[model samples]
Target: GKECDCSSPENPCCDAATCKLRPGAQCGEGLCCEQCKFKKKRTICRIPRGDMPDDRCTGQSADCPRYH
Candidate 1:
């Protein structure tokens, strides 16, 4: 894998395969908890809610799949 440049001043400090599809998106927070690109049946983020209404998190789950 290549190095991520999250150190950029304007970066959101997030990484994942999905990040390429949608930047600045976090599962169970602002964006919908979608299925993992690698695993169709499995979810990208293990958020219990499965889907969130907004782009904010309240600690529903800790296993966030950052950097795909």
Candidate 2:
């Protein structure tokens, strides 16, 4: 059971974030679609087509992640 204290009108969600372990291959958990920790567009971090090919996105053509 739980109780509410009515201390504020707006109640934002306060759940703990769930992070999954990163698989050892070509992917990591919670990999942001567009931005990385530096907020730089995630163009270089993408999985290359063959291991040597450059990612197809760069400069103005790179689109940031829209939805989580």
Candidate 3:
């Protein structure tokens, strides 16, 4: 919990990154984060196109996460 206190502001990663683990650390836990890092836009990071490439990078640290 304390380890990821900075992971929620829910933590704002963009347009308001008032925390740590930017462009990397905060990215190490969620989607779009491959190999513990952020990827490029439209870059498929998960699902392997099941219904669609759900985990695609939309911004510097933004990527769609697979939620069910």
Candidate 4:
């Protein structure tokens, strides 16, 4: 139910607050992630799920945005 290959740095995706939930969505910090469509917000980071080893979020550098 989506389609937006716009951030085409050779088909890049998810950024500016994020917008690439391919059958996935469950953010943190009270967890209010729903239909999060972005283009210039940039501040949706997480990492409060498991503490580490794949807790998700840290996209400023520490990649782990739920690839499970």
Candidate 5:
């Protein structure tokens, strides 16, 4: 259901005490965002890691990893 660096274990999805998704900034890039903006409204971001969970442009600005 997800596949990316926001897909990795040491991915810098966010740099706070807690991971926070940032659209094309922190979380979005890792999720599936390009580098300046997000993919699509319903674009499936992180494919599936079997451990993390689903990461879409809907998780956080791409939808931050607040779920973590």
Candidate 6:
């Protein structure tokens, strides 16, 4: 039920925050998101739930861990 294609570069999906649950937004199950830091910049990444990597923790948002 994922509305956006997080895997693709076109639609990077949601940011390090929560997924967009708009009125007509697409939804999915087991969809998780995390933050990845590169070049001293924090970027949002879609990852597996409960399997967050420690490397990405350097630039992560506790306010938004995973989104479904």
For all predicted structures, in order, the TM-scores are 0.14, 0.20, 0.38, 0.16, 0.31, 0.16
Candidate 6: C-alpha lDDT: 0.32
Model 6 bad stretches (over 4 Å) = 1-40, 54-68
Worst 10 residues of 5 by lDDT: 59-68
Which structure is stronger by TM-score: 3 or 4?
3
**Which structure among the candidates has the greatest lDDT?**
3
Model 4 per-residue lDDT tens digits across residues 1-68:
55442233232233334444333322211222223322122344444566453333333333235532
Give the residue spans of candidate 5 off by over 4 A. Answer: 1-28, 49-54, 63-68
Question: Roughly what TM-score does model 5 have, to 2 decimal places?
Answer: 0.31
Model 4: what TM-score?
0.16
Over the stretch 6-58, how does candidate 1's per-residue lDDT look in tens digits? 32334343444423323433332223233312223223443345565322322
Model 4: pairs clashing at backbone N, Cα or C within 3 Å: 17-42
Once model 3 is optimally superposed onto the true structure by TM-score, how far is the C-alpha of residue 22 displaced, in angstroms? 7.5
- Determine which window of 10 residues in candidate 1 has minimal summed lDDT: 32-41
Angstrom error at residue 46, model 2: 1.8
Off by over 4 Å in 1: 1-21, 28-68
Candidate of highest TM-score: 3
- If candidate 6 were superposed on the true structure by all CA atoms, what would the RMSD be? 12.5
Question: How much lDDT does each candidate structure score?
Answer: 0.34, 0.29, 0.53, 0.33, 0.47, 0.32
Model 1 clashes, total count: 7
Angstrom error of the Cα, residue 7, model 1: value is: 30
| Alpha carbon lDDT at 34, candidate 5 | 62
**Over the stretch 1-68, how does candidate 6's per-residue lDDT look in tens digits?**
65442344333333324444333323222212323212122334345568665232223232233332
Deviation from truth (RMSD, Å), model 2: 14.3
* lDDT (Cα, tens digit) per residue for candidate 3, span 1-68: 23542444444442234545556354644666655456667776566646653456664673575522
TM-score of 3: 0.38
